[PDB]
Amino acid sequence: PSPLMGGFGMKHPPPQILIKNTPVPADPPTAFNKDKLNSFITQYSTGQVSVEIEWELQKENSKRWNPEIQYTSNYYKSNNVEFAVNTEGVYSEPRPIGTRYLTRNL
Amino acid sequence: GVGSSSGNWHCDSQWLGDRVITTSTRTWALPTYNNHLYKQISNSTSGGSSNDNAYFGYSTPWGYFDFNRFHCHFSPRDWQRLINNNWGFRPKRLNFKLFNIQVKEVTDNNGVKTIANNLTSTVQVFTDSDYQLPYVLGSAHEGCLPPFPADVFMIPQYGYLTLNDGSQAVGRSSFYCLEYFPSQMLRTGNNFQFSYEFENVPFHSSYAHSQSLDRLMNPLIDQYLYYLSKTINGSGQNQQTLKFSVAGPSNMAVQGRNYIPGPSYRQQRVSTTVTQNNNSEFAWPGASSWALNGRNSLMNPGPAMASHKEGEDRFFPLSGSLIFGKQGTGRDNVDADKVMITNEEEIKTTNPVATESYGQVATNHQSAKAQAQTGWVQNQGILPGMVWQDRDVYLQGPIWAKIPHTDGNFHPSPLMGGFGMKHPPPQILIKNTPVPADPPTAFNKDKLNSFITQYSTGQVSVEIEWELQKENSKRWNPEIQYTSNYYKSNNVEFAVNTEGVYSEPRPIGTRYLTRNL
Amino acid sequence: YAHSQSLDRLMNPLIDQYLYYLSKTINGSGQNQQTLKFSVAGPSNMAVQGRNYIPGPSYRQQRVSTTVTQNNNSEFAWPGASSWALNGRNSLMNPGPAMASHKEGE
């Protein structure tokens, strides 16, 4: 049951976290009306969110003699730095990076 | 504190063996009522009326909290669980919370409305725990908690009636000031709560009978009792005789019985196929009613009686059943497709049909001359040996009522359905404390007439524990159960539509399982 | 004590009921005008509201005026009286079930 787009398949994954601004009615009429209130004060909210994940690693103990292939940046000069902001403040990711650079036997 | 919440949102149901605990939270808004005043009201102030509609009373600046409807506590799925699996239920415990109070002030300039917080204002709340105020709950009024938990609702205004003579009052009339009670005062940051234990009440019967009261005998064995079967030998003069026969399976109508159907008060019969009705106006003139001090009141819904015979579900008693409105239905002269008419067909096994005579009685002495004469019984009171069922309760219907404080009563189950209690859940009264505007700088003895425009909002929570009575039937074949229909439709029943409006498409009773007599 | 409320006046005079009542059976004058119209029972029509409790039992009595000229010019003390029978003997229903003596102003 490994997910086909990649990753870890779990029967009990991290739960969904749901959030909502509590409605605040505007001034109701001074005579009773049984219909649900339709007039509300315009509101929004802001805040900080933190997520901390501990990951377990599995180290390599290869006996390969020659050097491996490694992900690296290229020294050649360019207008911008890869994985940084440009002059207008926009961050970008210039390429997809996988995980398979070290090698193992079958 | 201002920046700390006074309570959390609690809304679910727990099914714990023979108990179920329901919890509901809603958002409410409370305006200022009556400009903070007590006003005398009457049909004179309403514009006049007939004698049957005259009244005298008072409206107050207070509002009140009502949750006396089953959909305030049960979701449709929870109601399905309850009614498909239990013979009975009753309420045991109640807990009530009021929290997250917000008071807002409104300022209206020439062309702009500004709403701001008033951090130092208060709301007053109290419970009528000694039952000293007129009890207006138990009259099937609007203003309860909405069925859908996301709907924000407006708190209804409190008012009451007292003794009247036309539009005038007599010396026996009572005036009540609600400020003459101790109440808790809450700023934004305070909360209110209380607990209540229900009286011991009988379980509601969430079952139908699989036997009829006139079919309780063994269909294979004769009785050892005889009945008169013939009075004349044959055609001709002077043929008088007395012949007796054993009552048995071939003649079940004449068998001796130990118990008889309950009381009746006949209603007029109305067909939903309008062409079958008489071409005249008979809604008021043809209705059953009772009189009190010269005033006529509709007998509505009246004693619990079966709505119709077998195969006559198009007929309904004129004012013998609860009629609910569909979502979006108006208030004046709406068509039959806009309303929902309940039917108490499940009680036809013990209760007489609402639109029929109870039976026949002898009205003379036959002799050799007068023949035997009988008369119809249109209203039959209680007799020893009578059995009956009470009216069913509905997901949209009321839960409890207060039994009037009187010398005597009989079977005080409320006639619109539910649990009758001498000490029901108390009334909960709430009001925004008046905040005067700027007073003059010279003393004036008159009471202040200028106030800051304010309203309040908050959350309310109600938790009820209910005791259940489980079925242990030995019936072999499967029962009837409430179910949804698989066939496709534009909307889902008991859900919202594309515009966000929740609706309840039908009334749901409680009587699907079966029991013997 | 006496009651300061009437059994037919126990409702809130400001709020409608959520129950309907049949209000019209004919559209208007003429033939074949049958219809069914329903209305909300509210403060304007208190006589048709649904109620939970009803007045106690009755056993009707003959009415006698202390202004004698208003009474019928005949003897009706025994013949017009309410009674019950037991083993062929008639007894006056006296005083009988507890009922209100008269209407308002009578």
In the block, tokens 């130990």 appear at B258
Let me know: does B318 contact B281? Beta carbons within 8 Å: no
* Chain C residues near residue A32 by CB distance under 8 angstroms: 14-15
Closest by Cβ to B339, choosing from C35, C38, C56: C38
Chain breaks in chain C (C to N over 2.5 A) after: none
Q: Kindly state the DSSP code that residue C17 receives in the 8-state scheme.
A: B
Whether B143 and chain A come into contact, CB under 8 Å, resolves to: yes
What distance in Å separates the CA atoms of residue B425 and residue B73, rounded to the nearest whole number? 15
Two tokens at B73?
A: 């506590």
Closest CA relative to residue B263, chosen from B350, B380, B357, B378: B380
**B27 to A27: CB separation less than 8 angstroms, yes or no:** no
Burial of residue B149, with CB atoms counted within 10 A of its CB: 0-12 exposed, 13-18 middle, 19 or more buried = middle
The two three-digit tokens of residue B406, written as one number: 């009187």
Q: Is C57 on the interface with B (CB under 8 A)?
A: yes
- Residue ranges of E strands in B348-388: 359-362, 374-377, 379-380, 386-387
C82 vs C94: CA distance, rounded Å: 8
Between the CA of residue B73 and those of B22, B70, B164, what are the distances in Å? Answer: 6, 6, 37
C33 contact B CB<8A: yes
Put simply, whether B178 touches C (Cβ < 8 Å) is: no
**What's the per-residue H, E or C state across B417-474?**
CCEEECCCCCCEEEEECCCECCCCCCCCCCCCCCECCEEEEEEEEEEEEEEEEECCCC
Residue B58: name the closest of C10, C12, C4 by CA: C12
Query: How far separated are the first and last CA of chain C, in Å rounded?
Result: 22
Method of determination is cryo-EM
CA distance B19 to B14: 8
Per the annotation, binding residues of B for Ca(2+) are: 343, 346
Whether residue A32 and residue B143 make contact (CB cut-off 8 A), yes or no, is yes
Rounded distance between C-alpha atoms, residue C23 and residue C42, angstroms: 13
**Pairing state of beta strands B113-117 and B204-205?**
unpaired
Which residues in chain B have their CB less than 8 angstroms from residue A39's CB? Answer: none
Q: Compute the distance between CA of residue B267 and CA of residue B5 in angstroms, rounded to an integer.
A: 55
- Omega into C95 within 30° of 0, i.e. cis? yes
Identify whether the C-beta of residue B456 lies closer than 8 Å to the C-beta of residue B29. yes
> Is residue B103 within a helix (H) or strand (E), and if so which, with residue range?
strand B86-108
* Beta bridge pairs of residue B496: B502
Amino acid at B476: W
3-class SS letters over B35-76: HHCCEEEEHHHHCCCCHHHCCEEEEEEEEEECCCEHHHCCCH
Annotated binding site of B, which residues? Answer: 251, 284, 343, 346
Reference B338, options B392, B272, B399, B417; nearest CA is B272
The residue type of B392 is D
Q: Reduced to 3 states, what is the DSSP secondary structure of residue B372?
A: coil
Query: Between the CA of residue B103 and those of B9, B191, B294, B488, what are the distances in Å?
Result: 19, 14, 48, 47
The whole-angstrom separation of Cα B114 and Cα A26 is 10
CB contact under 8 A, B152 and A25: yes
Taking the Cβ of residue C29 and every Cβ of chain B, the question of whether any pair is shorter than 8 Å is answered with: no
CB-based contact A22:B150 (threshold 8 Å): no
Of B67, B140, B71, nearest to B427 by C-alpha is B67
Q: d(Cα B388, Cα B305) in Å, to the nearest integer?
A: 9
**B164 part of contact set with chain C, CB < 8 Å:** yes
A28: nearest CB among B31, B35, B459: B31
Q: Which helix (H) or strand (E) holds B78?
A: helix B76-85
* Residue to test with chain A: of B154, B155, B452, most A Cβ within 10 A: B154
Q: Work out the burial of residue B499: count CB atoms within 10 Å of its CB; fewer than 13 is exposed, 13-18 middle, 19 or more buried.
A: exposed
Is residue B6 classed as helix, strand or coil in its secondary structure? coil
For chain A, which chains pass the contact test of at least 3 CB pairs under 8 Å?
B, C
- Contact A100/C at CB under 8 A: no
Cβ–Cβ of A27/B104 closer than 8 Å? yes
Q: B299 touching C, CB under 8 A?
A: yes
Tell me the Cα Rg of chain A: 26
| Identity at C32, one-letter amino acid code | N
Of all residues in chain B, the one with the smallest CA distance to A24 is B457
**Cα Rg of chain C, angstroms:** 22
C45 is in an annotated binding site: yes
User: By the CB < 8 Å criterion, does A91 face chain C?
Assistant: no
Residue with tokens 């195969």: B311
Instruction: Enumerate residues 6+ apart whose C-beta is below 8 A from B383.
Output: B260, B263
Task: Give the amino acid at B387.
Answer: V
Q: What is the DSSP string of C65-93?
A: -SSGGGS-SS--TTTTS-EEEETTEEEE-
SS3 for B138-204, per residue? CCCECCCCCCCCCCEEECCEEEEEECEECCEECCCCCCCCHHHCCCEEECECECEEEEEECCCCCCE
B347 backbone φψ class: left, alpha, beta (φ>0; ψ -120 to 50): alpha
Q: Which residues of C touch B301 (CB under 8 A)?
A: 50
Does C43 lie at the interface with A, CB-CB under 8 angstroms? no
Residue B232 and residue B246: Cα distance in Å, rounded?
A: 18
Instruction: Give B279-295 as a 3 state SS string.
Output: CCCCCCCCCCEEEECCE
Strand partners, B90: B467
Rg (CA), chain B: 29
| Nearest residue in chain B measured CA to CA from C1 | B406
- B100 contacts B6 by C-beta, under 8 angstroms: yes
Burial class (CB in 10 A: 0-12, 13-18, 19+), B36: middle
Largest CA distance in chain A: 87
Distance CA C106, CA A65 (A): 121
Q: Which of C25, C37, C40 minimises the CB distance to B335?
A: C37
- CB-nearest partner of C7 from B318, B401, B404: B404
